Amino acid sequence: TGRPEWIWLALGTALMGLGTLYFLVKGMGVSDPDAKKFYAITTLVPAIAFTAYLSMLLGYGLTMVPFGGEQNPIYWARYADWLFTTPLLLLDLALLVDADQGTILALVGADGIMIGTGLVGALTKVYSYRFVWWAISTAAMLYILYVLFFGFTSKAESMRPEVASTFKVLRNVTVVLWSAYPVVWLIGSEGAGIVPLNIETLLFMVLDVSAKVGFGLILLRSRAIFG
Numbered sequence: 512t513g514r515p516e517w518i519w520l521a522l523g524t525a526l527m528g529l530g531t532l533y534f535l536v537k538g539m540g541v542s543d544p545d546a547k548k549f550y551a552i553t554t555l556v557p558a559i560a561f562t563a564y565l566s567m568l569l570g571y572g573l574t575m576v577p578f579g580g581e582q583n584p585i586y587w588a589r590y591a592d593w594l595f596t597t598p599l600l601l602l603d604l605a606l607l608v609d610a611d612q613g614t615i616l617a618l619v620g621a622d623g624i625m626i627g628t629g630l631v632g633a634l635t636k637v638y639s640y641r642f643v644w645w646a647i648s649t650a651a652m653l654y655i656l657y658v659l660f661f662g663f664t665s666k667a668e669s670m671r672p673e674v675a676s677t678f679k680v681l682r683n684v685t686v687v688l689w690s691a692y693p694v695v696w697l698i699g700s701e702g703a704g705i706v707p708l709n710i711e712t713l714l715f716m717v718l719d720v721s722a723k724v725g726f727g728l729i730l731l732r733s734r735a736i737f738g
């Protein structure tokens with residue numbers, strides 16, 4: 512085959528792999544129970560992403576969806592990746608500020624709708640409806656972001672400054688990155704088809720890598736993970 516975006520897939524594969532191993536190695540040398548918790552979660556995130564990037568690199572997770580009079584290439588392997596990586600990231604943040612069980616369930620469920628409608632939208636054949644699904648998926652995301660910003664930040668105030676200040680950073684990196692995904696989708700292959708697939712793939716690998724390995728390095732080097 513040799514599609515124009517493969518080099519971005521090979522690069523996402525690579526970065527996700529090194530990040531997985533470094534976290535794995537750093538996580539099995541720590542004795543603290545809580546630290547082990549955050550470590551097991553944060554290493555699983557880039558591990559799921561590495562397998563998904565590898566599959567796509569090798570020709571899987573791709574389907575030709577018909578709409579707009581064209582045969583559009585939609586990488587569905589992404590949603591298979593984000594379906595488990597996104598709620599796991601949310602969990603790290605909820606465990607950090609001592610989010611309540613009810614809070615966590617609702618964030619994971621919201622996350623579920625977001626990825627579900629997102630994929631359903633990316634597979635829809637009626638061009639206009641693709642945007643009806645995209646619309647719902649984004650509304651779910653804003654719910655998640657509102658909670659992280661208005662709820663979590665508030666509960667992180669009963670924590671120590673070291674924990675509150677680490678969460679702020681992760682909360683900020685998450686808000687900036689997640690907000691970018693609905694936009695790439697809209698002007699890319701699953702949407703308006705303005706940005707070509709090769710560029711779109713590069714945009715996604717930068718967000719995925721920053722939101723997983725970036726987020727991970729920040730959380731795992733902090734002392735807020737210790738019980």
Ligand SMILES: *C/C=C(C)/C=C/C=C(C)/C=C/C1=C(C)CCCC1(C)C
Pocket residue numbers: 593596597600625626629630645648649650652688689690692693696718719722723
């Ligand atoms: C490691 C991956 C991360 C942090 C992925 C975050 C992904 C999102 C915030 C995705 C959002 C989407 C929408 C708001 C609507 C359209 C489809 C999605 C799934 C691309």
